[PDB]
């Protein structure tokens, strides 16, 4: 988990944002699917109308984003053994407010239990 990458930016957004997703879990429920399970924030103007879940693999510079009104999204149609990066957002009428931490994890190999 290396946090930092940065904004240069001499502004700042809207004022009435939601929050970063509490309790952000994310394991590999399959070798070829992904299970992510998020919190709501506690913090945030009226309710959020969806959720966005950001999903991309380790080393595409190619982030994605897939419709979800849920705590809890599966993401099939992946690799096996391989690295996947993981985002909440919360989009309301406002704006899309701060961003999670990135949630890189490796999927199961159907290789073999292999230790790594």
Excluded at 7 to 18: I, M, S, W
Excluded at 19 to 24: D, M, R, S
Excluded at 35 to 52: A, D, F, H, L, R
Aim: charged share 20%; no cysteine.
């Amino acid at each position: 988990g290396s946090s930092g990458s940065s904004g240069r930016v001499e502004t700042q957004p809207e004022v009435q944002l939601p929050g970063p997703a509490p309790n952000l879990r994310a394991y590999a429920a399959s070798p070829t699917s992904i299970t992510v399970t998020w919190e709501t924030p506690v913090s945030g103007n009226g309710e959020i109308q969806n959720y966005k879940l950001y999903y991309m693999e380790k080393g595409t510079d190619k982030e994605q984003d897939v419709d979800v009104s849920s705590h809890s999204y599966t993401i099939n149609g992946l690799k096996k053994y391989t690295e996947y990066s993981f985002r909440v957002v919360a989009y309301n009428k406002h704006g899309p407010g701060v961003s999670t931490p990135d949630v890189a994890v490796r999927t199961l190999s159907d290789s073999g239990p292999s230790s790594g």
